[PDB]
């Protein structure tokens, strides 16, 4: 359980 | 302009990117609110759109389990959003603190989240970014209302309209249909509800992998399970609700209305 961030586009991580 | 004329600023409650949140009072009403004060000069074209769409979408929603946007004021180089005063912090923080919820507390929590999601869906709004980070506790008190927040990625939809509204959300909570670049709508929120409910009960997510390629493969495959021994004593109806939420075909996935009538919830 780690904090996750909101994206408004696709980015390959 | 109107913010200074109607609202009195008090102490700082939090800070964001180019934003401060202060307690305020609608002077003539004598009611206290959270005023989010945004430096619009610092925002990108993208950020401006997300503020505009957040201000419009949150304002048309009115539900006890949604952080109410009461007012939206644009002055000289500052935007003011007047929200419900919420002092309990994030559901995310409460889960980290308590590690996990009892079935009774998990059911009570997801009930309030589904009521919020049902309201959104009835009002023609898809949130697109349901996660414990975007759910706030009204106060520190036990049984304090859970309130849905941050409509920055929220979209308006006409009825059961499915369309490609773009790749948006939080990796761990992304629906198979968004990952598959499929036309999508209301069901994406119910998948996120499945991920949240799973986390509520055992305190870890159904999909995690440091390798995002693997993560997205697992989500698209619906490759989750109920590891032993933590899940061994969880009721079948609890797992049944998760299974019906974590359905990779959004057409076959349980709706917010249906979920509230599920034996494990029984709110509708």
PDB file of C-alpha atoms in Angstrom:
ATOM      1  CA  UNK A   1       0.000   0.000   0.000  1.00  0.00           C
ATOM      2  CA  UNK A   2       1.835   3.118  -1.385  1.00  0.00           C
ATOM      3  CA  UNK A   3       0.373   6.568  -2.358  1.00  0.00           C
ATOM      4  CA  UNK A   4      -0.397   6.759  -6.143  1.00  0.00           C
ATOM      5  CA  UNK A   5      -0.691   9.913  -8.351  1.00  0.00           C
ATOM      6  CA  UNK A   6      -3.382  10.972 -10.905  1.00  0.00           C
ATOM      7  CA  UNK A   7      -2.398  11.189 -14.641  1.00  0.00           C
ATOM      8  CA  UNK A   8      -4.355  13.021 -17.441  1.00  0.00           C
ATOM      9  CA  UNK A   9      -2.468  11.153 -20.274  1.00  0.00           C
ATOM     10  CA  UNK A  10      -0.637   7.826 -20.965  1.00  0.00           C
ATOM     11  CA  UNK A  11       3.056   7.690 -19.860  1.00  0.00           C
ATOM     12  CA  UNK A  12       5.051   4.375 -19.950  1.00  0.00           C
ATOM     13  CA  UNK A  13       6.632   3.868 -16.449  1.00  0.00           C
TER      14      UNK A  13
ATOM     15  CA  UNK B   1     -14.211  40.992  -5.846  1.00  0.00           C
ATOM     16  CA  UNK B   2     -16.992  38.718  -4.388  1.00  0.00           C
ATOM     17  CA  UNK B   3     -14.696  36.371  -2.316  1.00  0.00           C
ATOM     18  CA  UNK B   4     -13.393  39.265  -0.086  1.00  0.00           C
ATOM     19  CA  UNK B   5     -16.985  40.695   0.171  1.00  0.00           C
ATOM     20  CA  UNK B   6     -18.693  37.411   1.337  1.00  0.00           C
ATOM     21  CA  UNK B   7     -15.895  35.286   2.992  1.00  0.00           C
ATOM     22  CA  UNK B   8     -13.562  35.916   6.009  1.00  0.00           C
ATOM     23  CA  UNK B   9     -10.161  34.056   5.882  1.00  0.00           C
ATOM     24  CA  UNK B  10      -8.912  32.142   8.996  1.00  0.00           C
ATOM     25  CA  UNK B  11      -5.998  29.679   9.612  1.00  0.00           C
ATOM     26  CA  UNK B  12      -4.176  27.558   6.942  1.00  0.00           C
ATOM     27  CA  UNK B  13      -5.453  23.890   6.891  1.00  0.00           C
ATOM     28  CA  UNK B  14      -3.173  22.604   4.050  1.00  0.00           C
ATOM     29  CA  UNK B  15      -1.081  23.431   0.930  1.00  0.00           C
ATOM     30  CA  UNK B  16      -0.968  22.065  -2.664  1.00  0.00           C
ATOM     31  CA  UNK B  17       0.850  22.925  -5.941  1.00  0.00           C
ATOM     32  CA  UNK B  18       0.249  26.725  -6.415  1.00  0.00           C
ATOM     33  CA  UNK B  19      -2.657  26.436  -3.865  1.00  0.00           C
ATOM     34  CA  UNK B  20      -3.314  27.080  -0.114  1.00  0.00           C
ATOM     35  CA  UNK B  21      -6.425  25.815   1.809  1.00  0.00           C
ATOM     36  CA  UNK B  22      -7.612  28.094   4.686  1.00  0.00           C
ATOM     37  CA  UNK B  23     -10.663  27.794   6.982  1.00  0.00           C
ATOM     38  CA  UNK B  24     -13.135  30.610   6.062  1.00  0.00           C
ATOM     39  CA  UNK B  25     -16.642  31.803   7.162  1.00  0.00           C
ATOM     40  CA  UNK B  26     -19.511  32.976   4.878  1.00  0.00           C
ATOM     41  CA  UNK B  27     -19.882  36.147   7.057  1.00  0.00           C
ATOM     42  CA  UNK B  28     -23.685  36.656   6.497  1.00  0.00           C
ATOM     43  CA  UNK B  29     -24.438  32.874   6.944  1.00  0.00           C
ATOM     44  CA  UNK B  30     -22.062  32.272   9.938  1.00  0.00           C
ATOM     45  CA  UNK B  31     -21.038  28.863   8.424  1.00  0.00           C
ATOM     46  CA  UNK B  32     -17.329  27.785   8.236  1.00  0.00           C
ATOM     47  CA  UNK B  33     -15.886  26.271   4.981  1.00  0.00           C
ATOM     48  CA  UNK B  34     -12.502  25.261   3.451  1.00  0.00           C
ATOM     49  CA  UNK B  35     -11.371  27.949   0.911  1.00  0.00           C
ATOM     50  CA  UNK B  36      -8.882  26.534  -1.677  1.00  0.00           C
ATOM     51  CA  UNK B  37      -6.918  29.627  -2.931  1.00  0.00           C
ATOM     52  CA  UNK B  38      -5.207  28.922  -6.337  1.00  0.00           C
ATOM     53  CA  UNK B  39      -2.476  31.082  -8.024  1.00  0.00           C
ATOM     54  CA  UNK B  40      -3.921  30.858 -11.614  1.00  0.00           C
ATOM     55  CA  UNK B  41      -0.813  32.705 -13.036  1.00  0.00           C
ATOM     56  CA  UNK B  42       1.328  29.579 -12.211  1.00  0.00           C
ATOM     57  CA  UNK B  43      -1.059  27.029 -13.912  1.00  0.00           C
ATOM     58  CA  UNK B  44      -0.382  25.444 -17.371  1.00  0.00           C
ATOM     59  CA  UNK B  45      -3.121  25.370 -20.105  1.00  0.00           C
ATOM     60  CA  UNK B  46      -3.745  21.700 -19.029  1.00  0.00           C
ATOM     61  CA  UNK B  47      -4.081  22.679 -15.288  1.00  0.00           C
ATOM     62  CA  UNK B  48      -6.515  25.559 -16.224  1.00  0.00           C
ATOM     63  CA  UNK B  49      -8.860  23.095 -18.083  1.00  0.00           C
ATOM     64  CA  UNK B  50      -8.757  20.657 -15.076  1.00  0.00           C
ATOM     65  CA  UNK B  51      -9.612  23.538 -12.622  1.00  0.00           C
ATOM     66  CA  UNK B  52     -12.470  24.770 -14.936  1.00  0.00           C
ATOM     67  CA  UNK B  53     -13.938  21.219 -15.357  1.00  0.00           C
ATOM     68  CA  UNK B  54     -13.462  20.473 -11.574  1.00  0.00           C
ATOM     69  CA  UNK B  55     -15.284  23.770 -10.671  1.00  0.00           C
ATOM     70  CA  UNK B  56     -18.192  22.983 -13.105  1.00  0.00           C
ATOM     71  CA  UNK B  57     -18.578  19.211 -12.292  1.00  0.00           C
ATOM     72  CA  UNK B  58     -18.213  19.383  -8.438  1.00  0.00           C
ATOM     73  CA  UNK B  59     -20.712  22.342  -8.365  1.00  0.00           C
ATOM     74  CA  UNK B  60     -23.520  20.347 -10.141  1.00  0.00           C
ATOM     75  CA  UNK B  61     -23.100  17.491  -7.543  1.00  0.00           C
ATOM     76  CA  UNK B  62     -24.886  17.729  -4.126  1.00  0.00           C
ATOM     77  CA  UNK B  63     -24.549  14.608  -1.866  1.00  0.00           C
ATOM     78  CA  UNK B  64     -23.552  14.072   1.824  1.00  0.00           C
ATOM     79  CA  UNK B  65     -20.724  11.660   0.644  1.00  0.00           C
ATOM     80  CA  UNK B  66     -19.304  14.181  -1.925  1.00  0.00           C
ATOM     81  CA  UNK B  67     -17.144  17.161  -0.731  1.00  0.00           C
ATOM     82  CA  UNK B  68     -19.665  19.939  -1.656  1.00  0.00           C
ATOM     83  CA  UNK B  69     -18.308  22.825  -3.817  1.00  0.00           C
ATOM     84  CA  UNK B  70     -20.499  25.734  -2.514  1.00  0.00           C
ATOM     85  CA  UNK B  71     -18.945  28.548  -4.646  1.00  0.00           C
ATOM     86  CA  UNK B  72     -16.302  29.249  -7.383  1.00  0.00           C
ATOM     87  CA  UNK B  73     -14.885  32.844  -7.654  1.00  0.00           C
ATOM     88  CA  UNK B  74     -12.315  34.189 -10.221  1.00  0.00           C
ATOM     89  CA  UNK B  75     -10.516  37.438  -9.110  1.00  0.00           C
ATOM     90  CA  UNK B  76      -7.278  39.196 -10.302  1.00  0.00           C
ATOM     91  CA  UNK B  77      -4.858  36.216 -10.695  1.00  0.00           C
ATOM     92  CA  UNK B  78      -6.486  34.088  -7.892  1.00  0.00           C
ATOM     93  CA  UNK B  79      -9.224  31.361  -8.083  1.00  0.00           C
ATOM     94  CA  UNK B  80     -11.275  30.530  -4.908  1.00  0.00           C
ATOM     95  CA  UNK B  81     -13.102  27.160  -4.441  1.00  0.00           C
ATOM     96  CA  UNK B  82     -15.373  27.081  -1.299  1.00  0.00           C
ATOM     97  CA  UNK B  83     -15.704  23.420  -0.095  1.00  0.00           C
ATOM     98  CA  UNK B  84     -17.194  21.576   2.925  1.00  0.00           C
ATOM     99  CA  UNK B  85     -14.786  21.866   5.921  1.00  0.00           C
ATOM    100  CA  UNK B  86     -13.329  18.281   6.183  1.00  0.00           C
ATOM    101  CA  UNK B  87     -10.810  17.679   9.062  1.00  0.00           C
ATOM    102  CA  UNK B  88     -10.548  13.808   9.197  1.00  0.00           C
ATOM    103  CA  UNK B  89      -7.827  13.587   6.472  1.00  0.00           C
ATOM    104  CA  UNK B  90      -7.734  11.000   3.610  1.00  0.00           C
ATOM    105  CA  UNK B  91      -9.219   7.448   3.741  1.00  0.00           C
ATOM    106  CA  UNK B  92      -5.708   6.476   2.413  1.00  0.00           C
ATOM    107  CA  UNK B  93      -4.064   7.850   5.636  1.00  0.00           C
ATOM    108  CA  UNK B  94      -6.703   6.093   7.859  1.00  0.00           C
ATOM    109  CA  UNK B  95      -6.036   2.717   6.048  1.00  0.00           C
ATOM    110  CA  UNK B  96      -2.207   3.145   6.572  1.00  0.00           C
ATOM    111  CA  UNK B  97      -2.842   3.986  10.302  1.00  0.00           C
ATOM    112  CA  UNK B  98      -5.374   1.140  11.010  1.00  0.00           C
ATOM    113  CA  UNK B  99      -3.657  -1.273   8.475  1.00  0.00           C
ATOM    114  CA  UNK B 100      -7.122  -2.681   7.409  1.00  0.00           C
ATOM    115  CA  UNK B 101     -10.914  -2.454   8.173  1.00  0.00           C
ATOM    116  CA  UNK B 102     -13.268  -5.094   9.710  1.00  0.00           C
ATOM    117  CA  UNK B 103     -15.963  -6.368   7.238  1.00  0.00           C
ATOM    118  CA  UNK B 104     -18.520  -4.205   9.193  1.00  0.00           C
ATOM    119  CA  UNK B 105     -16.342  -1.029   8.747  1.00  0.00           C
ATOM    120  CA  UNK B 106     -15.329  -1.933   5.112  1.00  0.00           C
ATOM    121  CA  UNK B 107     -19.052  -2.483   4.176  1.00  0.00           C
ATOM    122  CA  UNK B 108     -20.050   0.825   5.918  1.00  0.00           C
ATOM    123  CA  UNK B 109     -17.178   2.648   4.059  1.00  0.00           C
ATOM    124  CA  UNK B 110     -17.865   1.193   0.528  1.00  0.00           C
ATOM    125  CA  UNK B 111     -21.664   1.787   1.078  1.00  0.00           C
ATOM    126  CA  UNK B 112     -20.976   5.586   1.389  1.00  0.00           C
ATOM    127  CA  UNK B 113     -18.540   5.474  -1.629  1.00  0.00           C
ATOM    128  CA  UNK B 114     -21.204   3.675  -3.791  1.00  0.00           C
ATOM    129  CA  UNK B 115     -23.898   6.251  -2.728  1.00  0.00           C
ATOM    130  CA  UNK B 116     -21.458   9.028  -3.875  1.00  0.00           C
ATOM    131  CA  UNK B 117     -20.743   7.100  -7.165  1.00  0.00           C
ATOM    132  CA  UNK B 118     -24.511   6.412  -7.713  1.00  0.00           C
ATOM    133  CA  UNK B 119     -25.193  10.205  -7.329  1.00  0.00           C
ATOM    134  CA  UNK B 120     -22.366  11.066  -9.842  1.00  0.00           C
ATOM    135  CA  UNK B 121     -23.753   8.479 -12.355  1.00  0.00           C
ATOM    136  CA  UNK B 122     -27.406   9.723 -11.942  1.00  0.00           C
ATOM    137  CA  UNK B 123     -26.164  13.368 -12.432  1.00  0.00           C
ATOM    138  CA  UNK B 124     -24.288  12.247 -15.629  1.00  0.00           C
ATOM    139  CA  UNK B 125     -20.716  12.376 -14.168  1.00  0.00           C
ATOM    140  CA  UNK B 126     -17.914   9.725 -14.307  1.00  0.00           C
ATOM    141  CA  UNK B 127     -15.182  10.457 -11.651  1.00  0.00           C
ATOM    142  CA  UNK B 128     -12.478   8.348 -13.489  1.00  0.00           C
ATOM    143  CA  UNK B 129     -10.045   8.533 -10.467  1.00  0.00           C
ATOM    144  CA  UNK B 130     -11.642   6.735  -7.434  1.00  0.00           C
ATOM    145  CA  UNK B 131      -8.909   5.867  -4.838  1.00  0.00           C
ATOM    146  CA  UNK B 132      -8.469   6.233  -1.020  1.00  0.00           C
ATOM    147  CA  UNK B 133      -6.308   9.386  -1.709  1.00  0.00           C
ATOM    148  CA  UNK B 134      -9.451  11.042  -3.286  1.00  0.00           C
ATOM    149  CA  UNK B 135     -11.752  10.088  -0.316  1.00  0.00           C
ATOM    150  CA  UNK B 136     -11.746  12.345   2.822  1.00  0.00           C
ATOM    151  CA  UNK B 137     -13.161  11.667   6.355  1.00  0.00           C
ATOM    152  CA  UNK B 138     -15.559  14.475   7.527  1.00  0.00           C
ATOM    153  CA  UNK B 139     -13.873  14.531  11.016  1.00  0.00           C
ATOM    154  CA  UNK B 140     -11.551  12.446  13.319  1.00  0.00           C
ATOM    155  CA  UNK B 141     -14.646  10.916  15.095  1.00  0.00           C
ATOM    156  CA  UNK B 142     -15.436   7.173  14.467  1.00  0.00           C
ATOM    157  CA  UNK B 143     -18.325   6.689  11.951  1.00  0.00           C
ATOM    158  CA  UNK B 144     -17.470  10.107  10.363  1.00  0.00           C
ATOM    159  CA  UNK B 145     -18.841  10.392   6.762  1.00  0.00           C
ATOM    160  CA  UNK B 146     -16.476   9.397   3.877  1.00  0.00           C
ATOM    161  CA  UNK B 147     -16.653  12.121   1.134  1.00  0.00           C
ATOM    162  CA  UNK B 148     -15.527  11.760  -2.554  1.00  0.00           C
ATOM    163  CA  UNK B 149     -13.127  14.601  -3.628  1.00  0.00           C
ATOM    164  CA  UNK B 150     -10.835  15.846  -6.490  1.00  0.00           C
ATOM    165  CA  UNK B 151     -13.047  15.899  -9.666  1.00  0.00           C
ATOM    166  CA  UNK B 152      -9.970  17.185 -11.644  1.00  0.00           C
ATOM    167  CA  UNK B 153     -10.217  14.137 -14.021  1.00  0.00           C
ATOM    168  CA  UNK B 154     -14.087  13.931 -13.880  1.00  0.00           C
ATOM    169  CA  UNK B 155     -16.066  13.911 -17.216  1.00  0.00           C
ATOM    170  CA  UNK B 156     -19.736  14.613 -18.140  1.00  0.00           C
ATOM    171  CA  UNK B 157     -21.558  11.738 -20.006  1.00  0.00           C
ATOM    172  CA  UNK B 158     -25.085  11.672 -21.607  1.00  0.00           C
ATOM    173  CA  UNK B 159     -26.934   8.617 -20.130  1.00  0.00           C
ATOM    174  CA  UNK B 160     -25.164   5.276 -20.923  1.00  0.00           C
ATOM    175  CA  UNK B 161     -22.981   6.955 -23.656  1.00  0.00           C
ATOM    176  CA  UNK B 162     -19.661   5.015 -24.050  1.00  0.00           C
ATOM    177  CA  UNK B 163     -16.800   6.985 -25.759  1.00  0.00           C
ATOM    178  CA  UNK B 164     -12.960   7.309 -25.742  1.00  0.00           C
ATOM    179  CA  UNK B 165     -12.677  10.132 -23.120  1.00  0.00           C
ATOM    180  CA  UNK B 166      -8.840   9.650 -23.088  1.00  0.00           C
ATOM    181  CA  UNK B 167      -6.225   7.809 -20.936  1.00  0.00           C
ATOM    182  CA  UNK B 168      -6.636   9.277 -17.393  1.00  0.00           C
ATOM    183  CA  UNK B 169      -6.609   7.989 -13.766  1.00  0.00           C
ATOM    184  CA  UNK B 170      -4.224   6.327 -11.247  1.00  0.00           C
ATOM    185  CA  UNK B 171      -2.294   3.221 -12.452  1.00  0.00           C
ATOM    186  CA  UNK B 172      -3.349   0.785  -9.640  1.00  0.00           C
ATOM    187  CA  UNK B 173      -7.081   1.753 -10.007  1.00  0.00           C
ATOM    188  CA  UNK B 174      -7.231   1.955 -13.886  1.00  0.00           C
ATOM    189  CA  UNK B 175     -10.026  -0.207 -15.442  1.00  0.00           C
ATOM    190  CA  UNK B 176      -9.198  -2.867 -18.090  1.00  0.00           C
ATOM    191  CA  UNK B 177     -11.277  -0.889 -20.702  1.00  0.00           C
ATOM    192  CA  UNK B 178      -9.136   2.304 -20.172  1.00  0.00           C
ATOM    193  CA  UNK B 179      -5.913   0.164 -20.446  1.00  0.00           C
ATOM    194  CA  UNK B 180      -7.450  -1.472 -23.621  1.00  0.00           C
ATOM    195  CA  UNK B 181      -8.195   2.071 -25.043  1.00  0.00           C
ATOM    196  CA  UNK B 182     -11.904   0.984 -25.358  1.00  0.00           C
ATOM    197  CA  UNK B 183     -14.892   3.383 -25.381  1.00  0.00           C
ATOM    198  CA  UNK B 184     -15.861   3.599 -21.646  1.00  0.00           C
ATOM    199  CA  UNK B 185     -18.199   5.324 -19.147  1.00  0.00           C
ATOM    200  CA  UNK B 186     -19.779   4.767 -15.693  1.00  0.00           C
ATOM    201  CA  UNK B 187     -18.401   1.196 -15.088  1.00  0.00           C
ATOM    202  CA  UNK B 188     -14.742   2.474 -14.685  1.00  0.00           C
ATOM    203  CA  UNK B 189     -15.779   3.918 -11.233  1.00  0.00           C
ATOM    204  CA  UNK B 190     -17.149   0.466 -10.125  1.00  0.00           C
ATOM    205  CA  UNK B 191     -13.791  -1.260 -10.979  1.00  0.00           C
ATOM    206  CA  UNK B 192     -11.964   1.359  -8.805  1.00  0.00           C
ATOM    207  CA  UNK B 193     -14.616   0.547  -6.085  1.00  0.00           C
ATOM    208  CA  UNK B 194     -13.492  -3.139  -6.334  1.00  0.00           C
ATOM    209  CA  UNK B 195      -9.791  -2.129  -5.870  1.00  0.00           C
ATOM    210  CA  UNK B 196     -10.754   0.151  -2.878  1.00  0.00           C
ATOM    211  CA  UNK B 197     -12.934  -2.599  -1.243  1.00  0.00           C
ATOM    212  CA  UNK B 198     -10.091  -5.203  -1.638  1.00  0.00           C
ATOM    213  CA  UNK B 199      -7.632  -2.703   0.043  1.00  0.00           C
ATOM    214  CA  UNK B 200     -10.199  -1.912   2.852  1.00  0.00           C
ATOM    215  CA  UNK B 201     -10.353  -5.612   3.963  1.00  0.00           C
ATOM    216  CA  UNK B 202      -6.625  -6.750   3.883  1.00  0.00           C
ATOM    217  CA  UNK B 203      -4.712  -3.393   3.555  1.00  0.00           C
ATOM    218  CA  UNK B 204      -2.887  -4.186   0.235  1.00  0.00           C
ATOM    219  CA  UNK B 205      -4.106  -3.823  -3.406  1.00  0.00           C
ATOM    220  CA  UNK B 206      -5.326  -6.678  -5.686  1.00  0.00           C
ATOM    221  CA  UNK B 207      -2.919  -5.420  -8.450  1.00  0.00           C
ATOM    222  CA  UNK B 208       0.671  -4.349  -7.596  1.00  0.00           C
ATOM    223  CA  UNK B 209       4.008  -4.783  -9.470  1.00  0.00           C
ATOM    224  CA  UNK B 210       7.012  -2.341  -9.631  1.00  0.00           C
ATOM    225  CA  UNK B 211       7.045  -3.357 -13.372  1.00  0.00           C
ATOM    226  CA  UNK B 212       4.105  -1.266 -14.774  1.00  0.00           C
ATOM    227  CA  UNK B 213       3.996  -3.473 -17.960  1.00  0.00           C
ATOM    228  CA  UNK B 214       3.308  -6.494 -15.623  1.00  0.00           C
ATOM    229  CA  UNK B 215       0.840  -4.357 -13.524  1.00  0.00           C
ATOM    230  CA  UNK B 216      -1.232  -3.367 -16.639  1.00  0.00           C
ATOM    231  CA  UNK B 217      -1.091  -6.992 -18.014  1.00  0.00           C
ATOM    232  CA  UNK B 218      -2.483  -8.274 -14.621  1.00  0.00           C
ATOM    233  CA  UNK B 219      -5.354  -5.659 -14.596  1.00  0.00           C
ATOM    234  CA  UNK B 220      -6.322  -6.467 -18.262  1.00  0.00           C
ATOM    235  CA  UNK B 221      -6.226 -10.253 -17.398  1.00  0.00           C
ATOM    236  CA  UNK B 222      -8.210  -9.695 -14.133  1.00  0.00           C
ATOM    237  CA  UNK B 223      -5.298 -11.676 -12.560  1.00  0.00           C
ATOM    238  CA  UNK B 224      -6.087 -11.014  -8.836  1.00  0.00           C
ATOM    239  CA  UNK B 225      -6.645 -13.601  -6.035  1.00  0.00           C
ATOM    240  CA  UNK B 226      -7.414 -13.830  -2.254  1.00  0.00           C
ATOM    241  CA  UNK B 227      -4.121 -14.963  -0.585  1.00  0.00           C
ATOM    242  CA  UNK B 228      -4.068 -17.180   2.591  1.00  0.00           C
ATOM    243  CA  UNK B 229      -4.443 -16.891   5.470  1.00  0.00           C
ATOM    244  CA  UNK B 230      -5.812 -13.254   5.615  1.00  0.00           C
ATOM    245  CA  UNK B 231      -8.675 -13.953   3.084  1.00  0.00           C
ATOM    246  CA  UNK B 232      -9.495 -17.481   4.491  1.00  0.00           C
ATOM    247  CA  UNK B 233     -11.927 -16.005   7.149  1.00  0.00           C
ATOM    248  CA  UNK B 234     -13.473 -13.261   4.863  1.00  0.00           C
ATOM    249  CA  UNK B 235     -17.178 -14.103   4.062  1.00  0.00           C
ATOM    250  CA  UNK B 236     -18.007 -15.421   0.538  1.00  0.00           C
ATOM    251  CA  UNK B 237     -20.462 -12.467  -0.041  1.00  0.00           C
ATOM    252  CA  UNK B 238     -17.566  -9.961   0.552  1.00  0.00           C
ATOM    253  CA  UNK B 239     -15.432 -11.797  -2.105  1.00  0.00           C
ATOM    254  CA  UNK B 240     -18.584 -12.095  -4.335  1.00  0.00           C
ATOM    255  CA  UNK B 241     -18.993  -8.245  -4.341  1.00  0.00           C
ATOM    256  CA  UNK B 242     -15.236  -7.763  -5.195  1.00  0.00           C
ATOM    257  CA  UNK B 243     -15.504 -10.401  -8.025  1.00  0.00           C
ATOM    258  CA  UNK B 244     -18.603  -8.594  -9.490  1.00  0.00           C
ATOM    259  CA  UNK B 245     -16.740  -5.201  -9.266  1.00  0.00           C
ATOM    260  CA  UNK B 246     -13.416  -6.637 -10.650  1.00  0.00           C
ATOM    261  CA  UNK B 247     -15.197  -7.957 -13.820  1.00  0.00           C
ATOM    262  CA  UNK B 248     -12.916  -7.230 -16.864  1.00  0.00           C
ATOM    263  CA  UNK B 249     -15.973  -6.837 -19.213  1.00  0.00           C
ATOM    264  CA  UNK B 250     -17.557  -3.499 -18.112  1.00  0.00           C
ATOM    265  CA  UNK B 251     -20.967  -4.646 -19.563  1.00  0.00           C
ATOM    266  CA  UNK B 252     -20.964  -7.656 -17.105  1.00  0.00           C
ATOM    267  CA  UNK B 253     -19.662  -5.527 -14.146  1.00  0.00           C
ATOM    268  CA  UNK B 254     -22.014  -4.715 -11.183  1.00  0.00           C
ATOM    269  CA  UNK B 255     -23.478  -1.134 -11.232  1.00  0.00           C
ATOM    270  CA  UNK B 256     -23.453   1.248  -8.180  1.00  0.00           C
ATOM    271  CA  UNK B 257     -27.273   0.718  -7.787  1.00  0.00           C
ATOM    272  CA  UNK B 258     -26.891  -3.138  -7.946  1.00  0.00           C
ATOM    273  CA  UNK B 259     -23.865  -3.041  -5.530  1.00  0.00           C
ATOM    274  CA  UNK B 260     -25.949  -1.121  -2.884  1.00  0.00           C
ATOM    275  CA  UNK B 261     -28.624  -3.932  -3.106  1.00  0.00           C
ATOM    276  CA  UNK B 262     -25.894  -6.671  -2.719  1.00  0.00           C
ATOM    277  CA  UNK B 263     -26.500  -8.756   0.475  1.00  0.00           C
ATOM    278  CA  UNK B 264     -23.089  -7.583   1.906  1.00  0.00           C
ATOM    279  CA  UNK B 265     -24.246  -3.868   1.680  1.00  0.00           C
ATOM    280  CA  UNK B 266     -28.136  -3.892   1.788  1.00  0.00           C
ATOM    281  CA  UNK B 267     -28.473  -0.021   1.702  1.00  0.00           C
ATOM    282  CA  UNK B 268     -31.036  -0.026  -1.217  1.00  0.00           C
TER     283      UNK B 268
END
